[PDB]
Amino acid sequence: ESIGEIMGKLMQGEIGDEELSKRIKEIFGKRLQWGYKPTHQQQLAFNLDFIKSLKEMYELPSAFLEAAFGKTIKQSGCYFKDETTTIDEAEEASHELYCERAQIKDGQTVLDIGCGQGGLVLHIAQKYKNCHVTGLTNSKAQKNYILMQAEKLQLSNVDVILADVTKHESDKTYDRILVIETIAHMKNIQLFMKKLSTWMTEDSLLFVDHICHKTFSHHFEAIDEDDWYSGFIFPKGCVTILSASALLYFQDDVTILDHWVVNGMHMARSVDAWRKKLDKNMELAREILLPGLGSKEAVNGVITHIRTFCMGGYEQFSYNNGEEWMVAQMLFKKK
Amino acid sequence: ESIGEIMGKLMQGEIGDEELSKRIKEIFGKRLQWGYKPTHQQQLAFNLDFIKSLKEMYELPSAFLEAAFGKTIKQSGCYFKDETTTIDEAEEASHELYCERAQIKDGQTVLDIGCGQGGLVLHIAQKYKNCHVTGLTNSKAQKNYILMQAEKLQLSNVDVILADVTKHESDKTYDRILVIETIAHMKNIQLFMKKLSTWMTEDSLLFVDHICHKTFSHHFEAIDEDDWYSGFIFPKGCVTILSASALLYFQDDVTILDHWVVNGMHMARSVDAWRKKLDKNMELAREILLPGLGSKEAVNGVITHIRTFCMGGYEQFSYNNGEEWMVAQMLFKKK
């Protein structure tokens, strides 16, 4: 079977969920074989090579997003206490976790880099009325959504910077900088962390949450010629999965204070909840998308892409009961 | 069996080698059970707790040393290419490895912290005639030995500082600072690395080699009431075994450039070679020690201690084909 063949059946809805899950699980299995080395000597050689290599380097309508994601349209791993925890509850729990670990206190200036649909920005703004909370996003649609929500929620302490963070120049500093699942998209990590440090003072803290593998780093890209999945999900080579410890080697400009990981079952439950909600609201979703996409085929294409992302993410993060791919968190101060 | 009972039989030479090895292997096995956590979440919690805790904190005659250790009396893990590599060859190979990884070049000023009997100091001084090489040791006997050897070898580029490194104050800086298996003895790591950084310029490099476990950190101390070994070897709580990654969290004042580990079989072969050489020269060793110790019983005691250290070290570093306890190496520059 060629890529073309599998892609054909997938797009026609000819692959059942069990086969789809099985196929993607196998692809991730091959990544594990690629990444695990026989000795720690070899593991560190592999990991440091990757780290050294790094140092050399249309939008969906909000109504569709509301029908697939949770209440605040969080697009990052959430935190599920119970088997019965809803996605809305898991969003709030994860916001709370970030506030704790980043040591948010009322009255601080807070910058959220790559703030998405602004769930965390709105959470902090509501909980800490004396905080001034700035979201930074490269999407005008996202900025517009956040500002409307802030207006609706009677929040007066929210602003949004519309910028490519890699290009953004400012003299402004913040007490707290948060980066929630944005760093995977950063082409230039060393320069990224350096830039963030220039937006900190001696009293600031930087909190980063990133998708990871516990042991090794990898680009999200085809493992071989049999891998139809990786390039389907990310048609660009624009996504890097750092190991859980990779950022420890990026302390030129910031210094680590604390380090955690969150088991991958939380991410797995997140993507599962999105997949189930999209499935439930499938008819509605196809209706919402049709105007802006132009044809039922183009609508089916976008839905297949998002649904497959969730199915694949489930297999990735649930692998070995969440003990392969997971979420890493780090707290830093400025040098 | 109480500690007293096992200690009694050990001191009388009543425990055969097989039983001795077995007993010590079991003690190390219990340490592994203590250190490995079921999830990476828990592993990082355990490791960060240890790291946070750190941030709150008679001499043997040279003739005896010559009869137990290799030619340069290296008292650190050596590097064995072949099954037939001698300890003398393994000493030289490890010196060479340090020179490569620390990027030693002719003409540099070089400081070796806790230089022991000065094998590395003498190696660098001989190989790089334009280097000025300083050893720092807290032992007058060690200083005296190094200076005599330098005289014998017609070396003019060696000096030795007699100091407790934790108390040593100087304005002098060095192009290269080497720390070979000394950091385990450092009570205050954060302050240690800070002090070293004040002896560096922007052009300096710092190379650290330390005994480690690949996964977790631990004090070298009794694992329970059945552990007669740990306190026998180190009657003080003065030895810490850092994980292979622990020093990544000590980058307040220095920044990592590279990171390696050396499989534990090299250390295992080192202690094995010492044990075999001591055994071969046993009669001679007892003769050498008798004057300064006063009784045959006191001589037997010192020999039992050193021999058991080697037997125990074998089981520790050879555990799981060298993939538990091993040697970590890191290269840093100043912030």
Ligand SMILES: C[S@@+](CC[C@H](N)C(=O)[O-])C[C@H]1O[C@@H](n2cnc3c(N)ncnc32)[C@H](O)[C@@H]1O
């Ligand atoms: C996976 S989403 C996480 C969003 C949000 N932090 C959350 O937790 O829901 C990553 C976000 O980074 C944003 N982003 C990616 N590259 C960016 C860049 N160069 N500048 C600014 N934002 C960027 C994307 O628009 C996206 O919303």
Ligand SMILES: C[S@@+](CC[C@H](N)C(=O)[O-])C[C@H]1O[C@@H](n2cnc3c(N)ncnc32)[C@H](O)[C@@H]1O
């Ligand atoms: C395990 S030996 C390694 C010696 C040598 N680097 C080698 O590789 O053979 C560690 C050395 O650190 C020295 N040392 C321990 N604490 C010290 C201190 N506070 N100041 C200076 N030297 C110290 C000891 O005297 C000992 O020689």
Ligand SMILES: COc1ccc(C[C@@H]2c3cc(O)c(OC)cc3CCN2C)cc1O
């Ligand atoms: C459909 O568009 C998208 C929707 C959501 C995301 C979120 C992104 C993401 C990326 C993954 O590879 C992943 O593995 C399971 C999980 C997640 C969830 C959180 N975050 C880090 C990216 C998209 O590109």
Ligand SMILES: COc1ccc(C[C@@H]2c3cc(O)c(OC)cc3CCN2C)cc1O
């Ligand atoms: C007998 O006195 C001693 C002789 C040599 C040492 C060397 C010390 C050491 C300590 C260990 O616990 C160990 O585990 C196997 C191995 C080694 C070899 C290298 N170095 C890091 C310490 C002593 O206290």
Ligand SMILES: [Cl-]
């Ligand atoms: Cl990320």
Ligand SMILES: [Cl-]
């Ligand atoms: Cl050490």
